[PDB]
Amino acid sequence: QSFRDNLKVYIESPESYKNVIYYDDDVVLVRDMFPKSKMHLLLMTRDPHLTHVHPLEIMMKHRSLVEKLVSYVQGDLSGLIFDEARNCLSQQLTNEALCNYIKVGFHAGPSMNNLHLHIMTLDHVSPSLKNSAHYISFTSPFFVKIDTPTSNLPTRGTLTSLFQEDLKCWRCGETFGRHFTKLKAHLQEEYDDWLDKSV
Amino acid sequence: QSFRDNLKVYIESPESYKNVIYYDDDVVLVRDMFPKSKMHLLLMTRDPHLTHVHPLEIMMKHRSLVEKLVSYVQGDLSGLIFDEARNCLSQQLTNEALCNYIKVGFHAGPSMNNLHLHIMTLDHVSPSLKNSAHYISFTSPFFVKIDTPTSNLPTRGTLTSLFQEDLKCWRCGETFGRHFTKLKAHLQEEYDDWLDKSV
DNA sequence: CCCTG
DNA sequence: AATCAGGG
DNA sequence: CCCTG
DNA sequence: AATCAGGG
Ligand SMILES: Nc1ncnc2c1ncn2[C@@H]1O[C@H](COP(=O)(O)O)[C@@H](O)[C@H]1O
Ligand SMILES: Nc1ncnc2c1ncn2[C@@H]1O[C@H](COP(=O)(O)O)[C@@H](O)[C@H]1O
Ligand SMILES: [Zn+2]
Ligand SMILES: [Zn+2]
């Protein structure tokens, strides 16, 4: 009905989309249409019950889905993911370098209704990263890493006013107040530095 | 030294500026470079002491200057002013129509340092009127009309937070919140209505 | 979610 | 250039 | 004051 | 599109 159901077509009809880089009966790996890092993918369950379950509920009470998703990411999709990353970053990056530069998690408050796990590089260098909320949502407790212990899931209390905070580089700790454009330029430098040291 | 002395050249060297439409030893009438109404003029004293006196002090303690300025506006400059107005609005407007559509006053807090009296039409239809503070500064107590009794001069207390208020049409009382662009379009309509009824 | 004003 | 309402 | 970002 | 910091 609304924009919030936009991801639905990927799990209904993955055979129709070239940016669906993997599908089977259970899951779909699709490119993020508005990548917030050089590589940004979404792993979606095709299970019609679970797809509408809130990610925090998934983390709390659906561990078997959580384990399955992790199995895909470390297993049958790992080669695929490393290749996407090498194409998006550099061919000269090894699996080990890439593995330490990739994060996997749910947003604590999704906008899209179909459950989707973000798998993305750490750089946050991207034209689609256009505002502070974008950046903060992937670099704060709002981003719930897939290996978060259940007792440490973020709470309504801990998330309060999170998008209003000063901008901080995830890599070196430097602060930028609310100067989003300054952060952007800094992220670019951080990426060039990391790339040059990693190739 | 700064932009705040920009009006100075008009009283030093009125002979150098075609937009100085009147000068003598005592005063200068010059077009406002950024008119906030269809007609917007500035009347400046050439007296080197008084030019730097704050307008509220002028109103309180320099009545003879106040009376002289008013004498110019109603006397030797009246024909000149009506012609400027007819050229800026419409040739079909009589002195009487124009007289009731013109206001004369000081800003309570000037940005320019050389004392200048605003003489302008009421329309506030102008490309140079670009923000709410512009509009409010000419349509609130911040605009100190030249015939304000001294006991009713605005105070620091009365001016507080004035530029943060909702926008109100000076002619019909309609409110626009902070929708400046909506006010603009409305002012245009108000002007067409007034013009059509006045010609 | 995004875009536009 | 950062912040925000409206609409899809 | 204005303009630009 | 409204609000604001910086600079001239
Ligand atoms: N039509 C689309 N196709 C693919 N990805 C999308 C589409 N629309 C939005 N997205 C992404 O979906 C993600 C939703 O994240 P969330 O904030 O967790 O709901 C964001 O990263 C968006 O860039
Ligand atoms: N260089 C200039 N020449 C003529 N008028 C100007 C110039 N710069 C600014 N102004 C006007 O000077 C006025 C100053 O008003 P105030 O806010 O009372 O200081 C405003 O109406 C400006 O548009
Ligand atoms: Zn950094
Ligand atoms: Zn009105």
Short mmCIF file of C-alpha atoms (C1' of nucleotides) and ligand atoms in Angstrom, two decimals:
data_model
loop_
_atom_site.label_atom_id
_atom_site.label_comp_id
_atom_site.label_asym_id
_atom_site.label_seq_id
_atom_site.Cartn_x
_atom_site.Cartn_y
_atom_site.Cartn_z
CA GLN A 1 0.00 0.00 0.00
CA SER A 2 2.64 2.52 1.09
CA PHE A 3 6.35 3.04 0.46
CA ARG A 4 6.94 0.92 3.59
CA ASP A 5 6.09 -2.22 1.62
CA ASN A 6 8.60 -1.40 -1.13
CA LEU A 7 11.01 -4.25 -0.24
CA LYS A 8 8.19 -6.78 -0.59
CA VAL A 9 8.68 -7.41 -4.31
CA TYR A 10 12.15 -8.83 -3.62
CA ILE A 11 10.80 -11.70 -1.52
CA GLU A 12 7.68 -12.25 -3.64
CA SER A 13 9.37 -12.17 -7.01
CA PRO A 14 13.18 -12.26 -6.69
CA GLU A 15 13.26 -13.75 -10.22
CA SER A 16 12.27 -10.33 -11.55
CA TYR A 17 15.19 -8.26 -10.22
CA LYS A 18 18.78 -8.29 -11.44
CA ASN A 19 19.91 -6.67 -8.18
CA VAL A 20 18.77 -9.75 -6.32
CA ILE A 21 22.18 -11.42 -6.25
CA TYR A 22 20.92 -14.54 -4.41
CA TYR A 23 17.63 -16.27 -3.73
CA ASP A 24 16.22 -19.60 -2.59
CA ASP A 25 13.00 -20.66 -0.83
CA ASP A 26 14.06 -19.07 2.48
CA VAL A 27 16.04 -15.87 1.80
CA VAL A 28 16.91 -13.14 -0.66
CA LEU A 29 20.12 -11.08 -0.88
CA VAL A 30 19.48 -7.83 -2.71
CA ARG A 31 21.50 -4.65 -3.30
CA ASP A 32 20.37 -1.61 -1.31
CA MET A 33 18.91 0.86 -3.80
CA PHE A 34 20.33 3.76 -1.77
CA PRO A 35 23.62 2.32 -0.45
CA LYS A 36 24.94 4.03 2.66
CA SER A 37 28.41 2.55 2.14
CA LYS A 38 30.41 1.55 -0.91
CA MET A 39 28.85 -1.90 -0.47
CA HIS A 40 25.37 -2.16 1.03
CA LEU A 41 23.24 -5.30 0.77
CA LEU A 42 20.02 -6.48 2.42
CA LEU A 43 19.36 -10.07 3.50
CA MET A 44 15.62 -10.73 3.75
CA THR A 45 13.68 -13.73 5.01
CA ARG A 46 10.95 -14.95 2.65
CA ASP A 47 8.94 -16.42 5.55
CA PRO A 48 5.58 -14.60 5.44
CA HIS A 49 5.13 -14.63 9.20
CA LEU A 50 8.58 -13.51 10.25
CA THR A 51 9.01 -10.88 7.54
CA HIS A 52 6.66 -8.64 9.55
CA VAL A 53 8.14 -9.40 12.97
CA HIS A 54 9.99 -6.43 14.50
CA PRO A 55 13.81 -6.99 14.44
CA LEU A 56 14.13 -6.56 18.23
CA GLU A 57 11.55 -9.36 18.66
CA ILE A 58 13.54 -11.41 16.17
CA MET A 59 16.73 -10.93 18.23
CA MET A 60 14.90 -11.74 21.47
CA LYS A 61 12.65 -14.64 20.52
CA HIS A 62 13.65 -15.98 17.09
CA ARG A 63 17.21 -17.16 17.61
CA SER A 64 16.91 -19.91 15.02
CA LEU A 65 16.29 -17.33 12.30
CA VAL A 66 19.18 -15.25 13.64
CA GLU A 67 21.50 -18.30 13.47
CA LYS A 68 20.30 -19.22 9.98
CA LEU A 69 20.96 -15.69 8.67
CA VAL A 70 24.46 -15.79 10.15
CA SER A 71 25.05 -19.22 8.58
CA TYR A 72 24.20 -17.81 5.14
CA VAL A 73 26.49 -14.80 5.63
CA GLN A 74 29.46 -16.90 6.78
CA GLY A 75 28.67 -19.78 4.44
CA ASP A 76 26.87 -20.04 1.12
CA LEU A 77 26.91 -16.27 0.57
CA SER A 78 30.42 -15.50 1.81
CA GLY A 79 32.16 -15.79 -1.55
CA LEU A 80 29.37 -13.80 -3.15
CA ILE A 81 29.64 -11.07 -0.51
CA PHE A 82 33.44 -10.80 -0.79
CA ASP A 83 33.10 -10.40 -4.56
CA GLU A 84 30.49 -7.65 -4.25
CA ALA A 85 32.85 -5.96 -1.80
CA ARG A 86 35.89 -6.32 -4.09
CA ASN A 87 33.90 -4.89 -7.00
CA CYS A 88 32.68 -1.99 -4.88
CA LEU A 89 35.95 -1.21 -3.12
CA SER A 90 39.03 -2.80 -4.66
CA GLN A 91 40.06 -6.09 -6.27
CA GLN A 92 43.26 -5.94 -4.17
CA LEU A 93 41.43 -6.53 -0.88
CA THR A 94 41.65 -9.97 0.69
CA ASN A 95 38.80 -11.75 2.48
CA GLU A 96 40.49 -11.06 5.80
CA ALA A 97 40.77 -7.32 5.15
CA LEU A 98 37.14 -7.30 3.98
CA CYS A 99 35.86 -9.34 6.89
CA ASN A 100 37.20 -6.73 9.35
CA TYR A 101 35.59 -3.95 7.33
CA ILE A 102 32.08 -5.35 7.12
CA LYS A 103 29.19 -5.02 9.55
CA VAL A 104 25.90 -6.89 9.77
CA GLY A 105 22.82 -5.79 11.69
CA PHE A 106 19.24 -4.58 11.96
CA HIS A 107 18.03 -1.02 12.45
CA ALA A 108 16.28 -0.77 15.83
CA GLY A 109 13.50 1.24 14.17
CA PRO A 110 13.05 0.21 10.51
CA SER A 111 11.17 2.33 7.96
CA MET A 112 10.54 -0.62 5.65
CA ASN A 113 8.17 -3.30 6.93
CA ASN A 114 9.77 -6.39 5.43
CA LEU A 115 12.49 -7.70 7.79
CA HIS A 116 15.91 -7.03 6.33
CA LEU A 117 19.43 -7.45 7.64
CA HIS A 118 22.00 -4.84 6.54
CA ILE A 119 25.37 -6.15 5.36
CA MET A 120 27.67 -3.31 4.47
CA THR A 121 31.22 -1.98 4.49
CA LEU A 122 32.34 0.40 7.24
CA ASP A 123 33.42 3.35 5.04
CA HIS A 124 30.11 5.22 4.83
CA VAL A 125 31.42 6.85 1.64
CA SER A 126 28.42 7.18 -0.68
CA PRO A 127 26.37 9.79 -2.57
CA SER A 128 23.25 8.29 -0.96
CA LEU A 129 24.47 9.12 2.55
CA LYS A 130 22.86 12.55 2.62
CA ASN A 131 22.09 13.46 6.23
CA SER A 132 23.23 12.97 9.80
CA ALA A 133 20.41 10.57 10.68
CA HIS A 134 21.62 8.25 7.91
CA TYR A 135 25.11 8.20 9.41
CA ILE A 136 24.07 7.95 13.06
CA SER A 137 21.60 5.13 12.36
CA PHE A 138 24.45 2.86 11.20
CA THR A 139 27.14 3.91 13.70
CA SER A 140 25.32 4.04 17.02
CA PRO A 141 23.36 1.59 19.20
CA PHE A 142 20.49 2.20 16.79
CA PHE A 143 22.33 -0.24 14.56
CA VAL A 144 21.85 -3.57 16.28
CA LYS A 145 24.71 -5.84 15.26
CA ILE A 146 23.60 -9.41 14.59
CA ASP A 147 25.86 -10.73 17.41
CA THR A 148 24.49 -8.43 20.11
CA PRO A 149 23.72 -10.39 23.26
CA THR A 150 20.00 -10.32 23.98
CA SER A 151 20.44 -8.67 27.38
CA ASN A 152 22.24 -5.78 25.66
CA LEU A 153 19.59 -4.94 23.05
CA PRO A 154 19.04 -1.18 22.97
CA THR A 155 16.01 0.23 24.76
CA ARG A 156 13.62 3.06 24.06
CA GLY A 157 15.49 4.77 26.88
CA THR A 158 18.95 4.30 25.34
CA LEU A 159 17.86 5.36 21.85
CA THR A 160 16.30 8.66 23.02
CA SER A 161 17.34 11.79 21.09
CA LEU A 162 20.11 9.78 19.44
CA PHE A 163 19.80 11.45 16.03
CA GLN A 164 20.38 14.89 17.60
CA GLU A 165 23.89 14.17 18.84
CA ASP A 166 27.18 15.50 17.53
CA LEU A 167 28.73 13.67 14.60
CA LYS A 168 31.70 11.45 15.45
CA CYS A 169 34.02 9.61 13.05
CA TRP A 170 33.55 5.88 13.65
CA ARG A 171 37.22 5.20 12.84
CA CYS A 172 39.28 7.85 14.66
CA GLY A 173 36.88 9.47 17.14
CA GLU A 174 37.08 13.02 15.75
CA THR A 175 33.97 15.17 16.33
CA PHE A 176 32.20 17.46 13.85
CA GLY A 177 29.26 18.90 15.75
CA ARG A 178 26.40 18.97 13.25
CA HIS A 179 28.66 19.79 10.31
CA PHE A 180 27.50 16.85 8.19
CA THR A 181 29.34 18.08 5.09
CA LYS A 182 32.60 18.14 7.06
CA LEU A 183 32.09 14.58 8.25
CA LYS A 184 31.46 13.53 4.62
CA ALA A 185 34.78 14.91 3.45
CA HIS A 186 36.48 13.34 6.43
CA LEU A 187 34.92 9.92 5.72
CA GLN A 188 36.37 10.11 2.23
CA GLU A 189 39.85 10.72 3.67
CA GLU A 190 39.39 7.91 6.18
CA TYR A 191 38.52 5.56 3.34
CA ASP A 192 41.51 6.51 1.20
CA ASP A 193 43.73 6.04 4.22
CA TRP A 194 42.27 2.63 5.05
CA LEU A 195 42.38 1.51 1.41
CA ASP A 196 46.00 2.58 0.96
CA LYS A 197 47.05 0.72 4.12
CA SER A 198 44.98 -2.37 3.32
CA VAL A 199 45.72 -3.10 -0.34
CA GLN B 1 35.39 50.53 7.54
CA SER B 2 32.55 48.00 7.50
CA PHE B 3 29.34 47.52 5.53
CA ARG B 4 27.61 49.55 8.27
CA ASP B 5 29.12 52.74 6.84
CA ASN B 6 27.82 52.00 3.33
CA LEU B 7 25.24 54.85 3.34
CA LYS B 8 27.97 57.37 4.13
CA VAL B 9 28.89 58.10 0.52
CA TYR B 10 25.41 59.53 -0.10
CA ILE B 11 25.87 62.32 2.43
CA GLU B 12 29.55 62.92 1.64
CA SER B 13 29.24 62.94 -2.12
CA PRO B 14 25.58 63.04 -3.24
CA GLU B 15 26.81 64.62 -6.50
CA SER B 16 28.24 61.24 -7.46
CA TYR B 17 25.05 59.15 -7.37
CA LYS B 18 22.17 59.22 -9.84
CA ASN B 19 19.92 57.52 -7.27
CA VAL B 20 20.27 60.55 -5.04
CA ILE B 21 17.07 62.24 -6.20
CA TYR B 22 17.54 65.29 -3.93
CA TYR B 23 20.33 66.99 -2.03
CA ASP B 24 21.20 70.28 -0.36
CA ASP B 25 23.53 71.27 2.50
CA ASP B 26 21.32 69.61 5.13
CA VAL B 27 19.75 66.43 3.68
CA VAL B 28 19.87 63.78 0.99
CA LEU B 29 16.98 61.74 -0.46
CA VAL B 30 18.28 58.53 -2.00
CA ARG B 31 16.64 55.38 -3.39
CA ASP B 32 16.96 52.28 -1.21
CA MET B 33 19.25 49.87 -3.04
CA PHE B 34 17.20 46.93 -1.77
CA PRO B 35 13.64 48.35 -1.73
CA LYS B 36 11.27 46.56 0.63
CA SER B 37 8.24 48.07 -1.11
CA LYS B 38 7.51 49.17 -4.66
CA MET B 39 8.77 52.60 -3.58
CA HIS B 40 11.45 52.80 -0.89
CA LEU B 41 13.50 55.93 -0.25
CA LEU B 42 15.87 57.05 2.51
CA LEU B 43 16.06 60.60 3.86
CA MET B 44 19.44 61.24 5.50
CA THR B 45 20.75 64.20 7.48
CA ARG B 46 24.16 65.47 6.34
CA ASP B 47 24.94 66.85 9.81
CA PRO B 48 28.11 65.00 10.91
CA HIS B 49 27.13 64.93 14.57
CA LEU B 50 23.54 63.80 14.23
CA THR B 51 24.16 61.25 11.48
CA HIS B 52 25.61 58.94 14.16
CA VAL B 53 22.96 59.62 16.80
CA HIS B 54 20.69 56.62 17.46
CA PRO B 55 17.16 57.20 15.99
CA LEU B 56 15.46 56.67 19.37
CA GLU B 57 17.68 59.44 20.82
CA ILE B 58 16.74 61.57 17.82
CA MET B 59 13.02 61.05 18.53
CA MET B 60 13.51 61.76 22.24
CA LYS B 61 15.94 64.68 22.27
CA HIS B 62 16.28 66.11 18.76
CA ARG B 63 12.77 67.30 17.94
CA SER B 64 14.00 70.12 15.73
CA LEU B 65 15.60 67.61 13.36
CA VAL B 66 12.43 65.51 13.47
CA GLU B 67 10.33 68.57 12.54
CA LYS B 68 12.74 69.58 9.77
CA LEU B 69 12.63 66.09 8.21
CA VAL B 70 8.83 66.17 8.28
CA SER B 71 8.84 69.65 6.70
CA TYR B 72 10.92 68.32 3.79
CA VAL B 73 8.63 65.31 3.31
CA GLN B 74 5.44 67.39 3.33
CA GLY B 75 7.02 70.34 1.54
CA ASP B 76 9.93 70.68 -0.87
CA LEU B 77 10.11 66.92 -1.50
CA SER B 78 6.40 66.14 -1.67
CA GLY B 79 6.03 66.53 -5.43
CA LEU B 80 9.23 64.57 -5.93
CA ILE B 81 8.01 61.77 -3.66
CA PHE B 82 4.59 61.53 -5.34
CA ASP B 83 6.31 61.23 -8.72
CA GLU B 84 8.63 58.45 -7.53
CA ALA B 85 5.54 56.71 -6.19
CA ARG B 86 3.57 57.15 -9.43
CA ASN B 87 6.50 55.79 -11.44
CA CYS B 88 6.87 52.83 -9.09
CA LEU B 89 3.18 52.02 -8.69
CA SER B 90 0.89 53.67 -11.23
CA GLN B 91 0.51 57.00 -13.01
CA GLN B 92 -3.24 56.81 -12.26
CA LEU B 93 -2.77 57.30 -8.51
CA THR B 94 -3.58 60.70 -7.04
CA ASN B 95 -1.60 62.42 -4.28
CA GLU B 96 -4.41 61.64 -1.84
CA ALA B 97 -4.41 57.92 -2.65
CA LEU B 98 -0.61 57.91 -2.38
CA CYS B 99 -0.51 59.87 0.85
CA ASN B 100 -2.65 57.21 2.56
CA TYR B 101 -0.39 54.47 1.21
CA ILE B 102 2.94 55.85 2.36
CA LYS B 103 4.71 55.45 5.68
CA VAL B 104 7.68 57.29 7.16
CA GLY B 105 9.82 56.12 10.06
CA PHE B 106 13.05 54.89 11.61
CA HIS B 107 14.02 51.31 12.42
CA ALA B 108 14.39 50.95 16.20
CA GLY B 109 17.59 48.98 15.63
CA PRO B 110 19.37 50.10 12.43
CA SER B 111 22.07 48.04 10.71
CA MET B 112 23.50 51.06 8.88
CA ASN B 113 25.22 53.68 11.02
CA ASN B 114 24.27 56.83 9.12
CA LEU B 115 20.86 58.08 10.34
CA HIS B 116 18.23 57.47 7.68
CA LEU B 117 14.48 57.87 7.60
CA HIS B 118 12.52 55.31 5.56
CA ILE B 119 9.81 56.67 3.24
CA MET B 120 8.03 53.86 1.48
CA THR B 121 4.73 52.55 0.15
CA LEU B 122 2.68 50.10 2.22
CA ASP B 123 2.51 47.22 -0.31
CA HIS B 124 5.67 45.34 0.68
CA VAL B 125 5.65 43.81 -2.81
CA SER B 126 9.30 43.52 -3.86
CA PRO B 127 11.92 40.95 -4.92
CA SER B 128 14.21 42.39 -2.22
CA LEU B 129 11.78 41.47 0.56
CA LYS B 130 13.27 38.03 1.13
CA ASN B 131 12.64 37.02 4.74
CA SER B 132 10.25 37.42 7.64
CA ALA B 133 12.53 39.78 9.56
CA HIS B 134 12.42 42.19 6.62
CA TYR B 135 8.63 42.21 6.71
CA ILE B 136 8.23 42.36 10.49
CA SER B 137 10.77 45.18 10.83
CA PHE B 138 8.54 47.50 8.76
CA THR B 139 5.12 46.39 10.05
CA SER B 140 5.57 46.17 13.80
CA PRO B 141 6.58 48.55 16.62
CA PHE B 142 10.14 47.99 15.44
CA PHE B 143 9.25 50.49 12.75
CA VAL B 144 9.04 53.77 14.61
CA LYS B 145 6.74 56.08 12.66
CA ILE B 146 8.01 59.67 12.55
CA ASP B 147 4.86 60.93 14.36
CA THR B 148 5.13 58.54 17.32
CA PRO B 149 4.66 60.42 20.58
CA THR B 150 7.85 60.30 22.63
CA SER B 151 6.18 58.56 25.57
CA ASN B 152 5.17 55.73 23.23
CA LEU B 153 8.61 54.95 21.77
CA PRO B 154 9.16 51.18 21.80
CA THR B 155 11.32 49.72 24.55
CA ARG B 156 13.81 46.89 24.71
CA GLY B 157 11.04 45.11 26.59
CA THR B 158 8.40 45.65 23.88
CA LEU B 159 10.71 44.68 21.03
CA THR B 160 11.75 41.33 22.60
CA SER B 161 11.51 38.27 20.34
CA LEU B 162 9.54 40.33 17.84
CA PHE B 163 11.10 38.76 14.74
CA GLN B 164 10.00 35.28 15.89
CA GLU B 165 6.28 35.98 15.75
CA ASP B 166 3.72 34.71 13.27
CA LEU B 167 3.36 36.63 10.03
CA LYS B 168 0.28 38.84 9.77
CA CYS B 169 -1.00 40.75 6.73
CA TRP B 170 -0.80 44.46 7.56
CA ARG B 171 -3.90 45.18 5.46
CA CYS B 172 -6.49 42.49 6.32
CA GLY B 173 -5.17 40.80 9.46
CA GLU B 174 -4.82 37.28 8.01
CA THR B 175 -2.14 35.10 9.64
CA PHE B 176 0.44 32.87 7.93
CA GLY B 177 2.48 31.37 10.75
CA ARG B 178 6.05 31.35 9.50
CA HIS B 179 5.06 30.62 5.90
CA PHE B 180 6.90 33.61 4.45
CA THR B 181 6.36 32.48 0.86
CA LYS B 182 2.60 32.38 1.47
CA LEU B 183 2.62 35.91 2.86
CA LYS B 184 4.54 37.05 -0.25
CA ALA B 185 1.90 35.71 -2.60
CA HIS B 186 -0.80 37.21 -0.42
CA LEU B 187 0.90 40.64 -0.41
CA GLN B 188 0.86 40.56 -4.20
CA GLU B 189 -2.90 39.93 -4.17
CA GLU B 190 -3.43 42.66 -1.59
CA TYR B 191 -1.57 45.09 -3.85
CA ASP B 192 -3.55 44.21 -6.97
CA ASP B 193 -6.74 44.61 -4.98
CA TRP B 194 -5.71 47.98 -3.57
CA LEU B 195 -4.47 49.21 -6.96
CA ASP B 196 -7.65 48.17 -8.75
CA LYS B 197 -9.81 49.95 -6.16
CA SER B 198 -7.60 53.04 -6.05
CA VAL B 199 -6.93 53.88 -9.70
"C1'" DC C 1 12.38 5.22 2.83
"C1'" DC C 2 12.93 9.36 -0.61
"C1'" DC C 3 12.29 14.08 -2.64
"C1'" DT C 4 10.70 18.95 -2.87
"C1'" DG C 5 10.10 23.01 -1.45
"C1'" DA D 1 24.30 24.39 4.76
"C1'" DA D 2 21.43 22.06 8.66
"C1'" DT D 3 16.60 21.38 9.96
"C1'" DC D 4 11.78 20.36 9.06
"C1'" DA D 5 6.73 19.58 7.00
"C1'" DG D 6 4.36 17.49 3.39
"C1'" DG D 7 3.50 13.78 0.19
"C1'" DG D 8 4.23 9.39 -2.12
"C1'" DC E 1 22.88 45.30 5.42
"C1'" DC E 2 23.66 41.26 1.91
"C1'" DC E 3 25.04 36.60 0.14
"C1'" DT E 4 26.62 31.73 0.39
"C1'" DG E 5 26.68 27.62 1.81
"C1'" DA F 1 11.19 26.15 2.26
"C1'" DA F 2 12.39 28.36 7.01
"C1'" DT F 3 16.39 28.98 10.03
"C1'" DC F 4 21.19 30.00 11.02
"C1'" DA F 5 26.64 30.81 11.00
"C1'" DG F 6 30.17 32.98 8.59
"C1'" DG F 7 32.14 36.77 6.04
"C1'" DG F 8 32.30 41.23 3.75
N1 LIG G 1 13.07 0.23 -3.51
C1 LIG G 1 14.13 -0.14 -2.75
N2 LIG G 1 14.94 -1.16 -3.13
C2 LIG G 1 15.99 -1.54 -2.37
N3 LIG G 1 16.31 -0.94 -1.21
C3 LIG G 1 15.58 0.08 -0.71
C4 LIG G 1 14.42 0.54 -1.47
N4 LIG G 1 13.88 1.55 -0.77
C5 LIG G 1 14.62 1.73 0.35
N5 LIG G 1 15.64 0.86 0.37
C6 LIG G 1 16.62 0.69 1.45
O1 LIG G 1 15.98 -0.01 2.49
C7 LIG G 1 16.65 0.26 3.73
C8 LIG G 1 15.65 0.34 4.85
O2 LIG G 1 16.31 0.44 6.10
P1 LIG G 1 15.50 0.59 7.46
O3 LIG G 1 15.80 2.01 7.82
O4 LIG G 1 16.17 -0.48 8.30
O5 LIG G 1 14.05 0.31 7.13
C9 LIG G 1 17.46 1.55 3.52
O6 LIG G 1 18.85 1.24 3.60
C10 LIG G 1 17.10 1.99 2.09
O7 LIG G 1 18.16 2.57 1.36
N1 LIG G 2 24.56 50.46 -0.58
C1 LIG G 2 23.30 50.83 -0.26
N2 LIG G 2 22.68 51.85 -0.88
C2 LIG G 2 21.43 52.22 -0.56
N3 LIG G 2 20.70 51.59 0.38
C3 LIG G 2 21.19 50.55 1.08
C4 LIG G 2 22.56 50.11 0.80
N4 LIG G 2 22.80 49.08 1.62
C5 LIG G 2 21.70 48.87 2.38
N5 LIG G 2 20.74 49.75 2.05
C6 LIG G 2 19.43 49.89 2.69
O1 LIG G 2 19.64 50.56 3.91
C7 LIG G 2 18.55 50.25 4.80
C8 LIG G 2 19.06 50.15 6.21
O2 LIG G 2 17.99 50.01 7.13
P1 LIG G 2 18.24 49.83 8.68
O3 LIG G 2 17.83 48.40 8.87
O4 LIG G 2 17.29 50.87 9.24
O5 LIG G 2 19.69 50.10 8.93
C9 LIG G 2 17.88 48.98 4.27
O6 LIG G 2 16.56 49.29 3.83
C10 LIG G 2 18.75 48.57 3.06
O7 LIG G 2 18.04 48.02 1.98
ZN ZN G 3 38.25 9.84 11.37
ZN ZN G 4 -4.30 40.59 3.59
#
